[PDB]
C-alpha cells in the first residue's frame, strides 16, 4: 500500500496547493479590480490572502517534496530560505489576525474616535509594520544562527531550525508566537461579541434579511416564514422610533397594507406573484429607509476558529514533545504541519464565499469579461 500512498499523497497535496492558490488569487484580484471591495477590512484580508498565497505556492510544494522524497534534496541554502520564508509568513499572518481583532475591538469600544482614523494609509502602515516585524523576528535567526554559533548542526539531507534543537526553546516559541496571540484574540472576540450583544438596527436587519430570503426562496414555506417573521419585526420596528413621526408611522402602514395582499397570494396557490411583489416592497421600502438614516463579527469568528483549530495539534505536539520525544511519531508531525498549511486553504472560504460582493466579483472574473 506504500506505493499507493505516495501517489495518493501527491494527488491530495497538489490538490490542496492548487485550491489554496486559486482561492487566494481570486480574493486578491477581486479586491484589486473592484472599488466596492476596497475597505480596511478588505485590506487586512488582502494581506492575509497574500500570506496564504505564499504558503500555497512555496511552502506546500517544498514540504511535499521533502516528505515524499524522504529527505531534503535542494540543499542547505534553499532549506534556510524555506524555513525563514514560511516562518516569517506565518508570523505575519498571526499578527494580521491580531490587527483585525484589535481593529474591530477599537471599532466597537471607541465609536466616536477610532473610525475617523480608520483609513487606507493607516491600514497599510499596520500591515507593512507587521510584515517587517515578522521578517526581523524570524529571518536573521533562522538564516544566520549557524554563523552566530560557528557551526551548522543540520546535516546533509536534513532541514530544520538549528536553534530549535532544544525542546524548551521550541515550547517558548509556541507560547510567545501562538498561545498568547490566541488568548488575546479570544478575549478581544469576547468583548466584541459581548458588545454586539441597537434594537431598531436588529429589526431593520431582520427586514432586509427576510426580504431577500423571499427572492432566494426555492419552495413555498420560505416565503411564508420570511413574510411572517419580517412582519413581526416590521411592526416591532414600527413601534420603535429614533410631523416626521407621522410619516415614519406611515411607512409601515403602507408597507403592511400591501404585505397582507402578498401573503394573500402566498396562500392562494400561486407563489410567483407573491414573490413578484418583492420589488414593489423594495421600491416602497426606499421611501422609508430614506428617512431611517453581526456579519462582520461572524466572519472574524470564522477566521479565528479556522486558525485555532488548524494550528492547535502541532502546538500540542510541541508541548508533549518537551517532556516526551517518542510520544509523537514523524507521521504525526507531518499531519500537524500539513494542518497548519490547511489553515491557508480554508481561509478564503470563511469570508469570500459568504460575501455577496465577493460572489459577484468571482462570477465576473470567471466569465468571458
Ligand X SMILES: C[N+]1(C)[C@@H]2C[C@@H](OC(=O)[C@H](CO)c3ccccc3)C[C@H]1[C@@H]1O[C@@H]12
Summarize as ranges the residues that interact with ligand X (CB under 6 A): 59, 86-87, 90-91, 94, 173-174, 177-178, 311, 314-315, 318, 337, 340
Q: Given its phi and psi angles, is residue 269 left (phi above 0), alpha (psi -120 to 50 degrees) or beta?
A: left
Cell, residue 63: 514540504
> Min. distance of Cβ 346 from ligand X in angstroms?
15
CB of 163 to ligand X, least distance (A): 13
User: What's the min distance (Å) between Cβ of 280 and ligand X?
Assistant: 54
97 or 108, CB closer to ligand X? 97
User: What's the closest the beta carbon of residue 167 comes to ligand X, in angstroms?
Assistant: 12
Compute the distance between CA of residue 58 and CA of residue 141 in angstroms, rounded to an integer: 20
- Cα gap 222→266, rounded to integer Å: 10
Which residue, 20 or 59, has its beta carbon nearer to ligand X?
Answer: 59
64 vs 91, beta carbon nearer ligand X: 91
Instruction: Give least dist CB 152 to ligand X, A.
Output: 20
| Cell output for 233 | 419585526
The DSSP string of 211-243 is HHHHHH--SSHHHHHHHHHHHHHHHHHHH----
Is the Cβ of residue 178 or residue 358 nearer to ligand X in the bound state? 178
Which one, 47 or 210, has the nearer CB to ligand X?
47
Cβ–Cβ under 8 Å, residues 120 and 43: yes
Q: How far is CA 145 from CA 68, 73, 94, 138, in A?
A: 28, 22, 23, 11
Nearest to 131 by CA among 56, 50, 64: 50
Contacts 24+ apart (CB under 8 A), 321-324: 321/167, 321/170, 321/171, 322/167, 322/168, 322/170, 322/171, 323/167
Which lies closer to ligand X via its Cβ, residue 24 or residue 315? 315
CA angle 300, 304, 310 (to 5 degrees): 145
What is the closest distance, in whole angstroms, from the C-beta atom of residue 175 to ligand X in the complex?
8
Q: Minimum distance from CB of 353 to ligand X (Å)?
A: 24
Nearer to ligand X, 161 or 277 (CB): 161
Would you say 228 or 334 has its CB closer to ligand X?
A: 334
Q: How far is the CB of 133 from ligand X (least distance, A)?
A: 12
Rounded to 5 degrees, what are φ and ψ at 296?
A: -65, -50
Amino acid at each position: 500500500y506504500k506505493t499507493f500512498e505516495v501517489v495518493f499523497i501527491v494527488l491530495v497535496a497538489g490538490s490542496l496547493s492548487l485550491v489554496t492558490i486559486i482561492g487566494n488569487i481570486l480574493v486578491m484580484v477581486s479586491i484589486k479590480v473592484n472599488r466596492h471591495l476596497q475597505t480596511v477590512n478588505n485590506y487586512f484580508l488582502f494581506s492575509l490572502a497574500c500570506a496564504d498565497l505564499i504558503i500555497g505556492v512555496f511552502s506546500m510544494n517544498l514540504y511535499t517534496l521533502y516528505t515524499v522524497i524522504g529527505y531534503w534534496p535542494l540543499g542547505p541554502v534553499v532549506c534556510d530560505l524555506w524555513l525563514a520564508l514560511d516562518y516569517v509568513v506565518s508570523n505575519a499572518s498571526v499578527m494580521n489576525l491580531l490587527i483585525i481583532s484589535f481593529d474591530r475591538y477599537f471599532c466597537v469600544t471607541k465609536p466616536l474616535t477610532y473610525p475617523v482614523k480608520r483609513t487606507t494609509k493607516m491600514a497599510g502602515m499596520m500591515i507593512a509594520a507587521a510584515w517587517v516585524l515578522s521578517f526581523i523576528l524570524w529571518a536573521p535567526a533562522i538564516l544566520f544562527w549557524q554563523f552566530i554559533v560557528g557551526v551548522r548542526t543540520v546535516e546533509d539531507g536534513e532541514c530544520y531550525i538549528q536553534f530549535f534543537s532544544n525542546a524548551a526553546v521550541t515550547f517558548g516559541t509556541a507560547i510567545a508566537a501562538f498561545y498568547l496571540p490566541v488568548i488575546i484574540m479570544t478575549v478581544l472576540y469576547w468583548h466584541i461579541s459581548r458588545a454586539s450583544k441597537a434594537d431598531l438596527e436588529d429589526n431593520w436587519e431582520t427586514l432586509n434579511d427576510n426580504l431577500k430570503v423571499i427572492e432566494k426562496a426555492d419552495n413555498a414555506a420560505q416565503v411564508k416564514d420570511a413574510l411572517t417573521k419580517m412582519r413581526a419585526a416590521a411592526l416591532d420596528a414600527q413601534k420603535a422610533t429614533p410631523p416626521e413621526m407621522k410619516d415614519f408611522r406611515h411607512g409601515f402602514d403602507i408597507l403592511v397594507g400591501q404585505i397582507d395582499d402578498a401573503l394573500k397570494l402566498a396562500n392562494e396557490g400561486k407563489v410567483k406573484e407573491a414573490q413578484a411583489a418583492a420589488e414593489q416592497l423594495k421600491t416602497t421600502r426606499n421611501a422609508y429607509i430614506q428617512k431611517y438614516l453581526k456579519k462582520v463579527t461572524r466572519t472574524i469568528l470564522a477566521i479565528l476558529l479556522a486558525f485555532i483549530i488548524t494550528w492547535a495539534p502541532y502546538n500540542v505536539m510541541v508541548l508533549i514533545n518537551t517532556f516526551c520525544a517518542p510520544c509523537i511519531p514523524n507521521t504525526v508531525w507531518t499531519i500537524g504541519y500539513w494542518l497548519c498549511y490547511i489553515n491557508s486553504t480554508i481561509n478564503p472560504a470563511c469570508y469570500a464565499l459568504c460575501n455577496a460582493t465577493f460572489k459577484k466579483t468571482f462570477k465576473h472574473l470567471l466569465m468571458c469579461h
